[PDB]
Amino acid sequence: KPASMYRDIDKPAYTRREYITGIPGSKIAQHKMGRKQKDADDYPVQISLIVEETVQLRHGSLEASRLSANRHLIKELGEEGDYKMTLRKFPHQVLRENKDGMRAAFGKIVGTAARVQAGEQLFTAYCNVEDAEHVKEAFRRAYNKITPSCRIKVERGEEL
Amino acid sequence: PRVELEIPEDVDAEQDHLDITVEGDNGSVTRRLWYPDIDVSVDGDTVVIESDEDNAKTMSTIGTFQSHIENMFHGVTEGWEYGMEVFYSHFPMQVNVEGDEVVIENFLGEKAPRRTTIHGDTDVEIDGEELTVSGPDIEAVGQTAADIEQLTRINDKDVRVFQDGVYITRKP
Amino acid sequence: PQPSRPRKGSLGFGPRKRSTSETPRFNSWPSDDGQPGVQGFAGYKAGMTHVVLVNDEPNSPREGMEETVPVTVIETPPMRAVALRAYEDTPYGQRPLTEVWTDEFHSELDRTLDVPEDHDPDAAEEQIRDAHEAGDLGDLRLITHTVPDAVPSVPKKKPDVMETRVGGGSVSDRLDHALDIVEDGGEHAMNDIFRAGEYADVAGVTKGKGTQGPVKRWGVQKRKGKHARQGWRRRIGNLGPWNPSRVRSTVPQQGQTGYHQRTELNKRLIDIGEGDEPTVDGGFVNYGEVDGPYTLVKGSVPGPDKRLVRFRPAVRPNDQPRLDPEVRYVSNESNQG
Amino acid sequence: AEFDADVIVDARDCIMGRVASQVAEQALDGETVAVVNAERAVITGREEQIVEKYEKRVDIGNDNGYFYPKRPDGIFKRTIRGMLPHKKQRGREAFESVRVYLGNPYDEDGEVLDGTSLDRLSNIKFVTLGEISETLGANKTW
RNA sequence: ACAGCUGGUUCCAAUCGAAACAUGUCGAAGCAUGACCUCCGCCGAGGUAGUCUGUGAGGUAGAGCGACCGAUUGGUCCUGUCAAACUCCAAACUUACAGACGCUGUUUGACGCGGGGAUUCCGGUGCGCGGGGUAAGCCUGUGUACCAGGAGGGGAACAACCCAGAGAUAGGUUAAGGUCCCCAAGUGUGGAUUAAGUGUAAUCCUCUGAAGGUGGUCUCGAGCCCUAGACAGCCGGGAGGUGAGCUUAGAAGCAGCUACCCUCUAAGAAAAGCGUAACAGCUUACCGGCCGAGGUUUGAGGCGCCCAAAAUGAUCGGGACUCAAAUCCACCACCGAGACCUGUCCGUACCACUCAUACUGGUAAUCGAGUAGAUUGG
RNA sequence: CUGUCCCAACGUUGGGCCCGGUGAACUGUACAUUCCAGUGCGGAGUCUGGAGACACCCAGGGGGAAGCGAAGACCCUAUGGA
RNA sequence: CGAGUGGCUUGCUACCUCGAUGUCGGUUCCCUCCAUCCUGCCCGUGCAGAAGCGGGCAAGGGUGAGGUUGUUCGCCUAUUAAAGGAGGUCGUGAGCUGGGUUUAGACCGUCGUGAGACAGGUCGGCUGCUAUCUACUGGGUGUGUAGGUGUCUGACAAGA
RNA sequence: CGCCACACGGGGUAAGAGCUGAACGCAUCUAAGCUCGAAACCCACUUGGAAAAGAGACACCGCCGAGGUCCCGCGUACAAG
Ligand SMILES: COC(=O)[C@@]12OC[C@]34[C@H]([C@@H](O)[C@@H]1O)[C@@]1(C)CC(=O)C(O)=C(C)[C@@H]1C[C@H]3OC(=O)[C@H](OC(=O)/C=C(\C)C(C)C)[C@@H]24
Ligand SMILES: [Cl-]
Ligand SMILES: [Cl-]
Ligand SMILES: [Cl-]
Ligand SMILES: [Cl-]
Ligand SMILES: [Cl-]
Ligand SMILES: [Cl-]
Ligand SMILES: [Cl-]
Ligand SMILES: [K+]
Ligand SMILES: [Mg+2]
Ligand SMILES: [Mg+2]
Ligand SMILES: [Mg+2]
Ligand SMILES: [Mg+2]
Ligand SMILES: [Mg+2]
Ligand SMILES: [Mg+2]
Ligand SMILES: [Mg+2]
Ligand SMILES: [Mg+2]
Ligand SMILES: [Mg+2]
Ligand SMILES: [Mg+2]
Ligand SMILES: [Mg+2]
Ligand SMILES: [Mg+2]
Ligand SMILES: [Mg+2]
Ligand SMILES: [Mg+2]
Ligand SMILES: [Mg+2]
Ligand SMILES: [Mg+2]
Ligand SMILES: [Mg+2]
Ligand SMILES: [Mg+2]
Ligand SMILES: [Mg+2]
Ligand SMILES: [Mg+2]
Ligand SMILES: [Mg+2]
Ligand SMILES: [Mg+2]
Ligand code: NA
Ligand code: NA
Ligand code: NA
Ligand code: NA
Ligand code: NA
Ligand code: NA
Ligand code: NA
Ligand code: NA
Ligand code: NA
Ligand code: NA
Ligand code: NA
Ligand code: NA
Ligand code: NA
Ligand code: NA
Ligand code: NA
Ligand code: NA
Ligand code: NA
Ligand code: NA
Ligand code: NA
Ligand code: NA
Ligand code: NA
Ligand code: NA
Ligand code: NA
Ligand code: NA
Ligand code: NA
Ligand code: NA
Ligand SMILES: [Sr+2]
Ligand SMILES: [Sr+2]
Ligand SMILES: [Sr+2]
Ligand SMILES: [Sr+2]
Ligand SMILES: [Sr+2]
Ligand SMILES: [Sr+2]
Ligand SMILES: [Sr+2]
Ligand SMILES: [Sr+2]
Ligand SMILES: [Sr+2]
Ligand SMILES: [Sr+2]
Ligand SMILES: [Sr+2]
Ligand SMILES: [Sr+2]
Ligand SMILES: [Sr+2]
Ligand SMILES: [Sr+2]
Ligand SMILES: [Sr+2]
Ligand SMILES: [Sr+2]
Ligand SMILES: [Sr+2]
Ligand SMILES: [Sr+2]
Ligand SMILES: [Sr+2]
Ligand SMILES: [Sr+2]
Ligand SMILES: [Sr+2]
Ligand SMILES: [Sr+2]
Ligand SMILES: [Sr+2]
Ligand SMILES: [Sr+2]
Ligand SMILES: [Sr+2]
Ligand SMILES: [Sr+2]
Ligand SMILES: [Sr+2]
Ligand SMILES: [Sr+2]
Ligand SMILES: [Sr+2]
């Protein structure tokens, strides 16, 4: 199904699992990537991917963007490289689909999505100064797999 | 902006409207230099290219007019020389100048002669396996030299195997 | 998915209406090359016969062999170039300036024209020459007529007037060439303009077929099979779709067929002669006997017998001229039988 | 043939629409206007797109007809008509008292109207009406 | 014959003026009862559409959850997210009553009560908030204003978008909107941008244009380098120990492993990229020369460009427009309604006089549009 | 076996066309020379913008008048009928 | 995974028509679209050549004949440069056809106590009208430009 | 069902191949300029076309007479005209 059907925030907050049954599992494999034993303050450089428009991103788009971002970091910095990426948003919003005409139209559950407001951080990677241009490229691949336009903002780095 | 170009002693250049004529011992070249708010004039013995505007588009053309005039100065004195070499693998190619046009016969085994017309005062001299294109107007000479190489264009078959054709050897 | 098919008939000969002049009017003329000369002649259609010829074409495997070629016999007696019209280049195209006439007129030209009694050929000639000096002169054409009285099989004595161009050398030399033809008596023959073996363009007003339906007029199909027995035999399917809610002029409809001007291109002149060599036994059907100046045009020519056809050197020939073909035999067999 | 013009306008190096707008205003005020040198009249912009617009107008049509002039003679005349209510009595009289010409059929040199002239030294992106007509397929007779 | 169904039901004017909703109904194409419209009689001094303040009611927006609840990360306390059917919090706002101001009522009797007559119970659209649905000129709520039943002005046309609520006639000034022509009024002023005919399209089924890309161009900021000569280009040099060692038949900058050292010097790697079977060969780093003025890295903004394919004839209404007749920032003067101001008249209501509802005089900023329908004079 | 078809042609008889005589009907809110686009209850000769358009008459085949003909048999509805 | 364009499929909605806008398929005849099957000019190649594969510009012209089936669709054959797709009220019944859908007759299977039913199958089963307007194809009569004969011009228009 | 005829060539472009050339000393097919380049576009060719309201041009004849109509014999024409 296209994202056009689920990208906007038009329906109410439908997250209550005690009233919703048959919710598909999250396609998101990991949320903490890289070296999850080391701290965030141990790295000189902190670059985040900032979502420009208020959207609803599906778990499949979240997985595709994360997989195409971390796979570049596994390629350029190694499998056990000196970095750590974090996906801070979790898919809480349960999605429906009316799949009979318009009679008894309340749809059955087909998936999950994450509500991200404009200006928020979807991804945040902590790396060293030499690996700064590799992460800006991991986010360039990651923003092409989500719905809004994005900003690659450096929050801790006066090394330019 | 304003760029002043000192005219050589061998050269003397007149101007009317937007046209600039440059005369010398190797010949004469008349060109039209027309662009918004750029005035090209002859101040005694210097050529002045000036404009009241300093934007990238205006600046691009001032620099283009400079190189056009400097090239005309070189053309009417020392001239422009383009050297070429006629190479063939199996079929003996016959390059000959027939009138105001250079004709290439028996190219790649063709029964029909390939020909191109020479641009203006440009002279094409042949000495066996070598061809030398020359004249005062670089525009005319550069094109006539190019026309000769383009004349043996092959789009149908592999260029790496079928390498026959006159190629530019010397660029001025 | 319903098979594709080219549309019925051509749209280039439109509208298919009756011709204004029965005398054909050329819309194009040949290029100025060699010696100054009149760019066309005229005659009257006689009929058809065949001729045995020796193959002139160098590229043919049959070069030198006997070949039977169909031919249209046209009676071409001498014509009279009675005047010289001059055109001037105006910003609105070419406009007629003046005409230079004569004194010598054919006895029966007063059947069509209000023949000149008082004219000044010198003041007209002066006007044309001042225009040439000014560089305002366009082209030079001659007002020409035919002598149908010379043709016994054609009932009309009333001359057919038409304008013909003079092209060739410089505008100065052809002005003079034109004036020399006129100032004599205007008399010129087919020989003066054409040579046997050249490609000519024949213009003519076609055979009149009155009003005919779409099948004959545009070559549309007849109704096929079961559709042919219902009450519709030679009527098209529909006059158009629902939308656009109008009938387009492109749909094949009924109306006038024939009696239209056609300009048949690249017609080879087999032989130009005089006498009774191409005449058929018992005479040409619905025409008569030929005994005078004629032309033999390869193949068909527009219009019926007795109709005025026009000649012009081919504006767009495909082949190079192969002059004076060897005529081994001309048929004289009766067209009846 | 003679046309007693009150105002004779020189279209040479002048922006067509601006001249046309003024020639219309004058014709409705009862003036007998004559546009001269329309082959040399000008219209600013990218030649490639200007020609496309005019070529489309020539390709447009049906059985009812959409007669669009190819000559600069008629193009300027049609531009003036678009600024006049030619279907109304007052507007037709105004239009019929305006005539466009190729060159200058008069002795007098025409006047250049204010705000209509284009400085060729300041402009490169423009076209001459004659150039438009040559591209449209018209016979150059100027 | 009956029908809850379709069609039709004939003169003028004056006042007021809806409901398309609630409850019940073999009810949903219908009725009844309410809501609401109107008319009559009664009552006799208050009333409350607005605002402010006081005394109360409330858990929606937002927020937050080591505050409950239930979701929802990882690490050897820290670290990452959420909620229509969660809340330690918490608006705007809505709402009860009271006072005050305002407005209104006591000859125009308000508020209220009683009675007669209805119509109506297919609604629609805009905006705000919604719920369903991929969406819809969708379905179904709610508040509000409008269309219906609302003219006139503008918007190309166009129920509901903008101005505007309108007795007659007349003069004037404006509103929305507009001032190059069609077309009334500017080819107005100061300045900047755009070259795509972008654009000349408030709203919209109607006016598309996206993710992505852009040394197209304009503007603003930051760091670094530079006349001790920067950036680039061109010339010259790019050297020895030594072809490093190991590996290996060989490897000599450049298959691989390890080291990656010091002389000469103004530079020159235990070699950055090609190239060879391996050499050779070509440049890179690095230094010098010629030249001479800004250069380089990065950030932000403006307009435009690419992305961009549809059927009879292309379009901003059309013409057509380029230091604009586009766009943005300011500014100046105008055109332009039935609005507003103004003269006269008319109707209606009320006041004075009157038997009068006949005259006459007076008041209306706080009277003048109207479908169904109630009332009344002709 | 053949014109059913390729693929249509020519001919025959009666019409058709012109003249004398006889002489209806269907249909008609009005206006009406339209065409291309648009708009509008979303399928316009009539609204908007343009384009085109001198009037009248003859013959034609039927594109449009959501052509004329029948208060849709389909479908639903009616506290209808058989 | 993300962003779109189209309005050819299907679905949704119930705005328009129930005092009727004639069905599917086919046929005949006309116009168009491009997202191009061929033809022209091109770029790349895992481009030697030949034959190809992929891409670009491009709608001038072409894109055909047949076997089963009512079929649209599709399967199949032999040819071909190729035998592209789509819009025009799923163009086209005051043009045709009437094979299918969908009346009244009948049979079979299934379901039903039964009348009878079926988004099952099967045989049979009707095609109205003299054109007022408009539209176009062709043909005339007048008026305008303002006596006549003959010859022309060329704004525009059509073409494959 | 038979027979005859139905180009080439110019001009300007698209995709594309290039020249000269700057912004940016270099480089660069492009920004200004230029040489090329499609069965496509324009011309060429065929057909219509003085009702093109700017309603056209030329030559001769004529205004008491040029010419035309009716009539008559007929078709190269034709449903009336
Ligand atoms: C003369 O006939 C008509 O006009 C009809 O229009 C098209 C139509 C109809 C109707 O519109 C209309 O009544 C539909 C278009 C309406 C529709 O909703 C629908 O779904 C169909 C299947 C129609 C097709 C056609 O059907 C006819 O039966 C129906 O035809 C008939 O109903 C009847 C006819 C021809 C006669 C027996 C009266 C058509
Ligand atoms: Cl048929
Ligand atoms: Cl047209
Ligand atoms: Cl008008
Ligand atoms: Cl410019
Ligand atoms: Cl009101
Ligand atoms: Cl434009
Ligand atoms: Cl009264
Ligand atoms: K219906
Ligand atoms: Mg090959
Ligand atoms: Mg015979
Ligand atoms: Mg015989
Ligand atoms: Mg009344
Ligand atoms: Mg009254
Ligand atoms: Mg919330
Ligand atoms: Mg109503
Ligand atoms: Mg004005
Ligand atoms: Mg636009
Ligand atoms: Mg009914
Ligand atoms: Mg039934
Ligand atoms: Mg019953
Ligand atoms: Mg119909
Ligand atoms: Mg394409
Ligand atoms: Mg086509
Ligand atoms: Mg068949
Ligand atoms: Mg259909
Ligand atoms: Mg039809
Ligand atoms: Mg029928
Ligand atoms: Mg019929
Ligand atoms: Mg059957
Ligand atoms: Mg059957
Ligand atoms: Na259901
Ligand atoms: Na019949
Ligand atoms: Na139909
Ligand atoms: Na313009
Ligand atoms: Na046109
Ligand atoms: Na009843
Ligand atoms: Na209701
Ligand atoms: Na009810
Ligand atoms: Na009911
Ligand atoms: Na009070
Ligand atoms: Na909110
Ligand atoms: Na109201
Ligand atoms: Na309006
Ligand atoms: Na535009
Ligand atoms: Na009323
Ligand atoms: Na037969
Ligand atoms: Na019709
Ligand atoms: Na779409
Ligand atoms: Na649909
Ligand atoms: Na059909
Ligand atoms: Na094509
Ligand atoms: Na088949
Ligand atoms: Na239909
Ligand atoms: Na049918
Ligand atoms: Na039928
Ligand atoms: Na060409
Ligand atoms: Sr919603
Ligand atoms: Sr994106
Ligand atoms: Sr002629
Ligand atoms: Sr012609
Ligand atoms: Sr029949
Ligand atoms: Sr229509
Ligand atoms: Sr509330
Ligand atoms: Sr003005
Ligand atoms: Sr101005
Ligand atoms: Sr300005
Ligand atoms: Sr619409
Ligand atoms: Sr918009
Ligand atoms: Sr974008
Ligand atoms: Sr295209
Ligand atoms: Sr009133
Ligand atoms: Sr009232
Ligand atoms: Sr109109
Ligand atoms: Sr008929
Ligand atoms: Sr191809
Ligand atoms: Sr068969
Ligand atoms: Sr189908
Ligand atoms: Sr099938
Ligand atoms: Sr079709
Ligand atoms: Sr049937
Ligand atoms: Sr079936
Ligand atoms: Sr069935
Ligand atoms: Sr008149
Ligand atoms: Sr190019
Ligand atoms: Sr005339």
Query: Are the CB atoms for A93 and A28 separated by under 8 Å?
Result: no
* D101 to chain C: closest CA residue: C91
Calculated CA dihedral for residues C143, C147, C153, C154, nearest 10 degrees: 40
Amino acid at C100: V
Q: Give the closest-approach CA distance of B76 to chain D in angstroms.
A: 28
Structure tokens at B109: 């085994």
Domains and CATH numbers, chain C: 1-38+207-257 (4.10.960.10), 39-77+189-206+258-337 (2.40.30.10), 78-188 (3.30.1430.10)
Cα separation, D26 vs D35, whole angstroms: 12
**Closest-CA distance of chain B to residue D125, Å:** 9
D105 CB-contact burial (10 Å; exposed 0-12 / middle 13-18 / buried 19+):
middle
Q: Which CATH superfamily does the domain covering B80-172 fall into?
A: Ribosomal protein L6 (3.90.930.12)
Alpha carbon distance B27, A105 (integer Å): 88
CB A41 within 8 A of CB A124: no
Task: Give the angle B14-B18-B24 at the CA atoms, nearest 5°.
Answer: 30
Q: Is the CB of C224 under 7 A from strand F?
A: yes
Pair C29, C167: CB distance under 8 Å: yes
CB A110 within 8 A of CB A24: yes
What's the Å distance between residue A24 CA and nucleotide G11 C1'? 26
* Structural domain boundaries enclosing A130: 1-160
Determine the distance between A67 (CA) and E299 (C1') in angstroms: 30
**Cβ pair C303, C154 in contact under 8 A:** no
Q: Which helix (H) or strand (E) holds A112?
A: strand A108-116
Q: CA-CA distance, B121 to B103, in Å (whole number)?
A: 18
Three-state secondary structure of chain C: CCCCCCCCCCCCCCCCCCCCCCCCCCCCCCCCCCCCEECCEEEEEEEEEEEEEECCCCCCCCCCCEEEEEEEEEECCCEEEEEEEEEEEECCEEEEEEEECCCCCCCCHHHCCCCCCCCCHHHHHHHHHHHHHHCCEEEEEEEEECCHHHCCCCCCCCCCEEEEEEECCCCCHHHHHHHHHHCCCCEECHHHHCCCCCEEEEEEECCCCCEECHHHHCCCCCCCHHHHCCCCCCCCCCCCCCCCCCCCCCCCCCEECCCCEEEEEEEEEEEEEEECCCCCCCCECCCECCCEEEEEEECCCCCCCCCEEEECECCCCCCCCCCCCCEEEECCCCCCC
Taking CA atoms, what residue in D is nearest to C248? D63
Nucleotides of F under 7 A from a protein CB: 4-9, 34-37, 43, 45, 50-53, 59-65
Q: Can you give the CATH number for the domain in which A53 is found?
A: 3.90.1170.10
Asked whether the beta carbons of A150 and A47 are under 8 A apart, the reply is: no
C241 CA to F46 C1' distance (Å): 24
CATH number (domain holding residue D86): 3.90.1180.10
Q: C230 beta carbon < 7 A from strand E?
A: no
What are the Cα distances from residue D31, in Å, to D22, D35, D95?
Answer: 11, 12, 10
Is D124's CB within 8 Å of B39's CB? no
> Rg for chain C (alpha carbons), in Å?
24
Nucleotide nearest to C244 (CA to C1'): E312
Kindly give, in sequence order, each residue whose CB lies less than 8 Å from that of residue C80, ignoring residues fewer than 6 positions away. Answer: C106, C144, C145, C147, C185, C186, C187, C188
Distance CA B107, CA B115 (A): 11
Which chains have at least 3 CB atom pairs separated by less than 8 Å from chain D? B, C
Query: Is B59 near strand G, with its CB below 7 A from some atom of it?
Result: no
CA dihedral D71, D77, D78, D81 (to 10 degrees): -170
Of all nucleotides in the shown strands, which has a C1' nearest the CA of C12? G159
The shortest C-alpha distance from C91 to chain D (Å) reads 5
Q: What residues are paired with C48 via a beta bridge?
A: C72
Q: Which of D72, D76, D141 is nearest to C93 (CA)?
A: D141
Query: Residue A8, CA: closest nucleotide via C1'?
Result: E134
Check CB contact of D140 with chain C, cutoff 8 Å.
Answer: no
Asked if residue D47 lies in contact with residue D75, where contact means CB atoms within 8 angstroms, the answer is no
> In the structure encoding, which two tokens stand for residue A153, read together?
């903002």
Output the CA D68–ligand 36 centroid distance in Å.
5
Q: Say how far apart CA C293 and CA C78 lie, in whole Å.
A: 8
For the stretch A84-108, what's the b/e string if a residue is b when 16 or more beta carbons lie within 10 angstroms of its beta carbon?
Answer: bbbbebebebbbbeeeeeeeeeeee
- What separation in angstroms does the CA of B105 have from each of B114, C68, D54? 6, 43, 45
> C44: which 2 tokens?
């009257």
Query: CB–CB of C91 and D63 under 8 A?
Result: no
Q: Count CB pairs under 8 A between chains C and D.
A: 14
Vertex B101: Cα angle to B96 and B106 (nearest 5): 40
D81 phi, psi to nearest 5 deg: -65, -30
Q: Decide: B and A in contact? Rule: 3+ Cβ pairs under 8 Å.
A: no
CA A131, CA A113: separation in Å to the nearest integer? 31
Burial (CB count within 10 angstroms: exposed 0-12, middle 13-18, buried 19+), residue B121: middle
Is the CB of residue C229 inside 7 Å of nucleic acid strand G?
no
Q: Residue D19 CA to nucleotide H50 C1', Å?
A: 31
What's the Å distance between residue A106 CA and nucleotide E32 C1'? 38
Run of H or E residues at D56: helix D47-59
Residue B32 forms contact with D (CB below 8 Å) = no
Residues 44-63 of D with CB under 8 A from C: 63
Find the distance separating the first CA and the last CA of chain C, reported in whole Å.
51
Strand F closer than 7 A to residue C230 Cβ: no
Angle (CA) C25 C28 C34, round 5°:
120
Q: Are C228 and C222 spatial neighbours (Cβ–Cβ below 8 Å)?
A: yes
Instruction: Tell which residue, C214, C237, C218, has the closest CA to residue C227.
Output: C237
The resolution in Å comes to 2.8
**Phi and psi for C331 in degrees, rounded to 5?**
-75, 140
Hey, what are A31's tokens? 């949320």
From the CA of C222, the nearest ligand is 2
Q: From residue B161, give the alpha-carbon distance in Å to each of B119, B154, C17, D2.
A: 31, 11, 63, 74
Chain C 241-300 residues in 7 Å CB range of strand H = 256, 258-268, 286, 298-300
Q: Which residues pair with B46 in a beta bridge?
A: B6, B43
From residue A49, how far is each of A46, A93, A138, A153, D95 by CA, in Å? 10, 21, 10, 7, 66
d(CA D68, CA D77): 11
The residue among C39, C24, C37, C42 whose CA lies nearest residue C293 is: C42
Residues 34-53 of B with CB under 8 A from D: 34-37, 39
In angstroms, the separation between the Cα of residue D102 and the nearest Cα of chain B is 25
Longest dimension (CA), chain B: 61
Give residue C243 CA to ligand 80 midpoint distance, Å. 13
Contact D63 C249 (CB under 8 A): yes
Q: Do C309 and C74 meet the contact criterion of CB atoms below 8 Å apart?
A: yes
CA C310, C314, C318, C320: dihedral to nearest 10 degrees?
120
* Residue A77, φ and ψ in degrees, nearest 5: -110, -5
B1-79 and B80-172 share one CATH topology?
Answer: yes
Work out whether strand D33-36 and strand D98-100 pair parallel, antiparallel, or are unpaired: parallel
Tokens of C313: 């050197």
Task: List, in sequence order, every residue forming a beta bridge with C300; answer none if it has no partner.
Answer: none
Is beta strand D42-44 parallel, antiparallel or unpaired with respect to D7-10? unpaired
CA of C260 to the centre of ligand 48 (A): 30
Residue C295 CA, nucleotide H31 C1', distance (Å) = 67
> Residue C274: beta bridge partners?
C293
- Experimental determination technique: X-ray
**Spacing of C80 CA from H56 C1' in Å:** 29
* Core vs surface per residue A39-77: b (16+ CB within 10 A) or e: eeeebebbbbbbbeeebbbbbbbbbbbbbebbebbbeeb
**Size of chain B in residues:** 172
| Token duo for residue D83 | 């600024």
Residue D21 DSSP label:
H
Domain segments of chain B: what residues?
1-79, 80-172
Chain B interface mutation, best of D120, D121, D123, highest count of B Cβ atoms under 10 Å? D121
Q: How many domains does chain D have?
A: 1
Residue C212 near residue C252, CB atoms below 8 Å: no
Architecture of the CATH domain B1-79: Alpha-Beta Complex (3.90)
d(CA C118, CA B159): 79
**Distance (Å, whole) CA D141 – CA C90:** 7
Q: Distance, in angstroms, between D117 CA and closest chain C CA?
A: 25
Residue B59, CB, strand H, below 7 Å: yes
